[PDB]
Design a protein around this ligand. Structure first.
Ligand SMILES: [Zn+2]
Length: 67
């Protein structure tokens, strides 16, 4: 997130070389994230966020919020 985040594929360029080295995982399930899901995230996620030691994005999809 504020520490670091990937808005879309253009930002992916930094992680694109060592993305495997970089950690991407469910913010809460903490299960392996299929890079297929990350690829859509990288293709153009409304917001993919990076927290030190913790990564978030898809897990937000695991839960929903209502206004
Ligand atoms: Zn999750």
């Amino acid at each position: 997130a504020m520490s670091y985040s990937l808005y879309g594929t253009t930002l992916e360029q930094q992680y694109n070389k060592p993305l495997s080295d970089l950690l991407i995982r469910c913010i809460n399930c903490q299960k392996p994230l299929s890079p297929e899901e990350k690829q859509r995230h990288l293709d153009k996620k409304q917001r993919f966020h990076n927290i030190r030691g913790r990564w978030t994005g898809r897990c937000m999809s695991c839960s929903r919020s209502s206004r």
